[PDB]
Amino acid sequence: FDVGDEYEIIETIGNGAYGVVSSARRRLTGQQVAIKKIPNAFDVVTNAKRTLRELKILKHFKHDNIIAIKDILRPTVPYGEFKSVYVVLDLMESDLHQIIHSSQPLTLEHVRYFLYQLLRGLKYMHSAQVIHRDLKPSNLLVNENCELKIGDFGMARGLYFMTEYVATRWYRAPELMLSLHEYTQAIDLWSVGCIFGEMLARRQLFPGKNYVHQLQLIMMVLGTPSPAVIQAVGAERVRAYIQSLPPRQPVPWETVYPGADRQALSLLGRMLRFEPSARISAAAALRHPFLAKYHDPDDEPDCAPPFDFAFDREALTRERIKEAIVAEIEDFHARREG
Ligand SMILES: CCOc1cc(N2CCC(O)CC2)ccc1Nc1ncc2c(n1)N(C)c1ccccc1C(=O)N2C
């Protein structure tokens, strides 16, 4: 690490393919933060593009249920030697994966409040025309006061070919799996369904071992998909596999989750569907009786203007992307002078 005399590192808390997250605190004030070192940020084209996407998306959003950038450290060395980017972020106590899968409490009210906040965050996000495409419990961060923030926007796109490799298997929407040529904000609401069902039972809803077994377990609850959907499948082998299986009626959610709440299973049923148009939106989900306790439309804003993904469609070299990223770091600091 290399954060200067402004911050103070404590302990490493997270690590992925393109990020080393660590807790810290600012010395002038004392408040706790998360610093995320992106090492060798400009060495690979895909990694540089993800980095510039996250910076622009997180700079666009200002919402209590979306991770915010608190600061981006400027280059300490001259430009040519600037290899590692440091991003200062909201520090959060844990994530929902850890919360669900532990000896911690998770009563119905926990699920209701967590779900409300996720959906509150998605309403704002979706109004900006941004699909997250990778919502899972481990990307839903939770703080000491039970506030839930959505994080990791590197997979996020707006409104390609190999769609079945978008996201993680267990939370991947059918339309991506089967390539149904209708990819919208609806993708996220499938994932929210899986998250919701996971909180109710404290185990994964559709834990598939492989591509085919993922389709099995989904069809064991939802039943066999309709002929309209079946014909919409692009690959010959998948369509052939579904048609070989016998017809199956949908199992009621009241039987899938026996002891669970009646109003919860109602809203779950509106999320977990084969047809993406058949799924309830985030905005309509907030209007459901299950979330009546927390719902207030004056406290649930949209995002305006929407997010432009045109920058990501450009064919830029590693250096041009480094220039683009450095421009954002400059723009961030220039925006905080008024
Ligand atoms: C005070 C330490 O709190 C934590 C403990 C654990 N652990 C202890 C280790 C156990 O094995 C597992 C749970 C995990 C996370 C946090 N907090 C935290 N806050 C903020 C972020 C973050 N994590 N990372 C890693 C993210 C993860 C997913 C998506 C986004 C982020 C992100 O961008 N930020 C800034």
Residue numbers in the entry: 49 to 207, 216 to 394
Reproduce text from the manuscript describing this model:
The ERK5 protein, which is encoded by the MAPK7 gene, comprises an N-terminal kinase domain and a large C-terminal domain containing transcriptional transactivating functionality and nuclear localization and export sequences (NLS/NES). ERK5 is the effector kinase of a canonical kinase module comprising MEK (MAPK/ERK kinase) 5, MEKK (MEK kinase) 2/3 and ERK5 itself.
Compound 2 has a primary alcohol in place of the methylpiperazine group of compound 1, an N-methyl in place of the N-cyclopentyl substituent on the tricyclic ring system, and an O-ethyl in place of an O-methyl at the meta-position of the phenyl group. These changes combine to yield a compound with a similar inhibitory potency to compound 1. The conventional, so-called type I, kinase inhibitor-binding mode is demonstrated by structures of ERK5 co-crystallized with the aminopyrimidine-containing compounds 2 and 3, while a novel allosteric binding mode was observed for three triazole-containing compounds (compounds 4–6). Compounds 2 and 3, like compound 1, bind at the conventional ATP-binding site, while compounds 4, 5 and 6 bind at a novel allosteric binding site. The aminopyrimidine motif forms a hydrogen-bond network with the backbone of Met140 in the ERK5 hinge region. The tricyclic ring systems of compound 1, and to a somewhat lesser extent compound 2, however, occupy a greater volume than the equivalent region of compound 3, with the benzene-ring fragment extending downwards to fit into the base of the ATP-binding site, whilst in compound 1 the N-cyclopentyl substituent points upwards towards the P-loop and packs against Ile61. Residues 208–215, corresponding to the central portion of the activation loop, could not be modelled in the complex with compound 2. As observed for the complex of compound 1 with ERK5, compounds 2–5 bind to a ‘DFG-in’ conformation of ERK5 in which both the hydrophobic R-spine (residues Leu106, Ile117, His180 and Phe201 in ERK5) and C-spine (Val69, Ala82, Leu144, Leu188, Leu189, Val190, Ile251 and Met255) are intact. Compounds 2, 3 and 5 were tested against a panel of 225 kinases representative of the kinome to assess the selectivity of these three different scaffolds. The kinase selectivity-profile data show that compound 5 is the most selective, while compound 3 is the most promiscuous, with the selectivity of compound 2 being intermediate.
